[PDB]
From Swiss-Prot, chain A:
Assembly description: Interacts with RHOA. Interacts with RAC1. Interacts with RAC2. Interacts with CDC42.
Disulfide bridge positions per record: none
Keyword set, alphabetical order: Acetylation, Cytoplasm, GTPase activation, Phosphoprotein
Record-listed Phosphotyrosine modification sites: 3
Gene responsible for this protein: ARHGDIB
Protein name: Rho GDP-dissociation inhibitor 2
Organism: Homo sapiens (Human)
Major place of residence: cytoplasm
Keyword Nucleotidyltransferase: no
GO cellular component: cytoplasm; cytoplasmic vesicle; cytoskeleton; cytosol; extracellular exosome; membrane
Function, as annotated: Regulates the GDP/GTP exchange reaction of the Rho proteins by inhibiting the dissociation of GDP from them, and the subsequent binding of GTP to them. Regulates reorganization of the actin cytoskeleton mediated by Rho family members.
Tissue: Detected in bone marrow, thymus and spleen.
Compartments it resides in: Cytoplasm, Cytosol
Curated annotation (Swiss-Prot), chain B:
Organism: Homo sapiens (Human)
GO cellular component: cell projection; cytoplasmic vesicle; cytoskeleton; cytosol; endoplasmic reticulum membrane; extracellular exosome; focal adhesion; lamellipodium
Keywords from the UniProt entry: Acetylation, ADP-ribosylation, Cytoplasm, Disease variant, Glycoprotein, GTP-binding, Hydrolase, Lipoprotein, Methylation, Nucleotide-binding, Prenylation
Primary localization class, coarse: cytoplasm
The name this protein goes by in its record: Ras-related C3 botulinum toxin substrate 2
Subunit note: Interacts with DOCK2, which may activate it. Interacts with S100A8 and calprotectin (S100A8/9). Found in a complex with SH3RF1, MAP3K7/TAK1, MAP2K7/MKK7, MAPK8IP1/JIP1, MAPK8/JNK1 and MAPK9/JNK2. Interacts with PAK1. Component of the phagocyte NADPH oxidase complex composed of an obligatory core heterodimer formed by the membrane proteins CYBA and CYBB and the cytosolic regulatory subunits NCF1/p47-phox, NCF2/p67-phox, NCF4/p40-phox and the small GTPase RAC1 or RAC2.
Compartments reported by the entry: Cytoplasm
Positions contributing to GTP binding: 10-17, 57-61, 115-118
Record PTM: (Microbial infection) Glycosylated at Tyr-32 by Photorhabdus asymbiotica toxin PAU_02230. Mono-O-GlcNAcylation by PAU_02230 inhibits downstream signaling by an impaired interaction with diverse regulator and effector proteins of Rac and leads to actin disassembly.
Length: 179, 181
C-alpha cells in the first residue's frame, strides 16, 4: 500500500539492545545465531551462486552457474516449453552484514527492445557460512505463437538498500516442445 | 507428515505472546510474560489430516524493523494482530503491518486477528477509551479492515478466556491446506 525501508542498524546495535532481556537474547540466537563470527574474507556481502529452473516435465536440467563465465551465458539460450509449470531455485550466501529484502529484477527484451519487467522478493537473511536456498511459488510459462520466440534478459539482484549484488544477461527461447 | 509455518505480527502490547502461550500451554500467563515466546510446534488434526504447526512470535518494536523480517522466509501463513480495544494498533495494521508483510511475502495468506475480545464489553476499558475520545473496534470495523487488506479470514479471540482462540490456529491451517491458486 505504501511501505518504506526501515532505518539502518548494524549487527552490533541489534545485539547490544535489550541486553538483559532473556527472551530477546534467545530470539537473537534463533535468528542471528551465536558463537564464532565466521566470515569469508574477499567476498561481497551477498554472492548468488546459481539460478535453477525446476521443471518436472523437462528432460535435462536447466540451470545457470553464476560463478562461471557470464559472457557465455550472455550468448547462450535456455529453452522453456510454452505453458509449462516451473519454480525458480536460488542459491546464495550472506557474508558479513544482514541483507534486507534481497530481490531479483529482470528486464526482458525482444527484437532489441524492452517488452517486459518482472521481479520477486527473496527476503531478508542473516550472515552465516552455509548457503541459503529459495524457491518461488509455481508459475506457468507463456503460451501461444505470439509469445513463442527468443527473448534477451537482463537480470540483477538488488535489495532494500539499492545495492547491486549481481548483474548478468542470458537468452530465453519459448518453444512448442523441449526438443 | 505435513509442515505449516505460522508467523504472528502486530503492535507491541496487542497480545501476540499471550495468544501463543495461552494456545500452546492451555493456560493464560497473567504473571510473567516474556517479550517473545520461543518457537514451538503443535501436532494438530484437521479432519483426518496430520499437521505439524510451527509457531513464531515476533518483536514488534520499531528498533527491530531490520531483524524481525529474518523470520518471514518460508512462512505459509501470517496472523496479523491488533487489539479490539486499541484503535492505534488497528491503524498500525494499515500503516505498518500489512505493508511490511506484503513487501516481504507478496503471496502468503493473511489472517486478521482481533485480540482481547473479553475487554470489548468491559465497562472500565470502554470508559477509559471514551476519555481519550476513542472506542473499541466493533465487528464491522474489523471486518472492514480485513477486506481492505484482502485477508483470507477475520477472526476475534481472547487469550484470557480462550474464546475463539483455538479457531484462530485451525483457520491458519485451513488457509494453507485449502488455498486459492
Ligand atoms: N484482557 C486481556 N488481556 C490480554 C489478552 N492478551 C494479552 N493481554 C494483556 O495485554 C498485554 C500485552 O500482552 P502480550 O502478549 O505480551 O503483548 P505482545 O507485545 O503483543 O506480545 C499484557 O498485559 C497481557 O496480560 C487478552 O486476551 N485479554
Ligand atoms: Mg510479546
Amino acid at each position: 500500500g505504501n511501505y518504506k525501508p526501515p532505518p539502518q542498524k548494524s549487527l552490533k546495535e541489534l545485539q547490544e539492545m535489550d541486553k538483559d532481556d532473556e527472551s530477546l537474547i534467545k530470539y537473537k540466537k534463533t535468528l542471528l545465531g551465536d558463537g564464532p563470527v565466521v566470515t569469508d574474507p574477499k567476498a561481497p556481502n551477498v554472492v548468488v551462486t546459481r539460478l535453477t529452473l525446476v521443471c518436472e516435465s523437462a528432460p535435462g536440467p536447466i540451470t545457470m552457474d553464476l560463478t562461471g563465465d557470464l559472457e557465455a551465458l550472455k550468448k547462450e539460450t535456455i529453452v522453456l516449453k510454452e505453458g509449462s509449470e516451473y519454480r525458480v531455485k536460488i542459491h546464495f550466501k550472506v557474508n558479513r552484514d544482514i541483507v534486507s529484502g534481497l530481490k531479483y529484477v529482470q528486464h526482458t527484451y525482444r527484437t532489441g527492445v524492452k517488452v517486459d519487467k518482472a521481479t520477486f522478493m527473496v527476503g531478508s537473511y542473516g550472515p552465516r557460512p552455509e548457503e541459503y536456498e529459495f524457491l518461488t511459488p509455481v508459475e506457468e510459462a507463456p503460451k501461444g505463437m505470439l509469445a513463442r520466440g527468443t527473448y534477451h534478459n537482463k537480470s540483477f539482484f538488488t535489495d532494500d538498500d539499492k545495492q547491486d549484488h549481481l548483474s548478468w544477461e542470458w537468452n530465453l527461447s519459448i518453444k512448442k516442445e523441449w526438443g | 507428515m505435513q509442515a505449516i509455518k505460522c508467523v504472528v505480527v502486530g503492535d507491541g502490547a496487542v497480545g501476540k505472546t499471550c495468544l501463543l502461550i495461552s494456545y500452546t500451554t492451555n493456560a493464560f500467563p497473567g504473571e510473567y510474560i516474556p517479550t517473545v515466546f520461543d518457537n514451538y510446534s503443535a501436532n494438530v488434526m484437521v479432519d483426518s489430516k496430520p499437521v505439524n504447526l510451527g509457531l513464531w512470535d515476533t518483536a514488534g518494536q520499531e528498533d527491530y524493523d531490520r531483524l524481525r523480517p529474518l523470520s518471514y522466509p518460508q512462512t505459509d501463513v501470517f496472523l496479523i494482530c491488533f487489539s479490539l480495544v486499541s484503535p492505534a494498533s488497528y491503524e498500525n495494521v494499515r500503516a505498518k503491518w500489512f505493508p511490511e508483510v506484503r513487501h516481504h511475502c507478496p503471496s502468503t495468506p493473511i489472517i486478521l486477528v482481533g485480540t482481547k475480545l473479553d475487554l470489548r464489553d468491559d465497562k472500565d476499558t470502554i470508559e477509559k477509551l471514551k476519555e481519550k475520545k476513542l472506542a473499541p473496534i466493533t465487528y464491522p470495523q474489523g471486518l472492514a479492515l480485513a477486506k481492505e487488506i484482502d485477508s483470507v479470514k477475520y477472526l476475534e479471540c481472547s487469550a484470557l478466556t480462550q474464546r475463539g482462540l483455538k479457531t484462530v490456529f485451525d483457520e491458519a491451517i485451513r488457509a494453507v491446506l485449502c488455498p486459492q491458486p
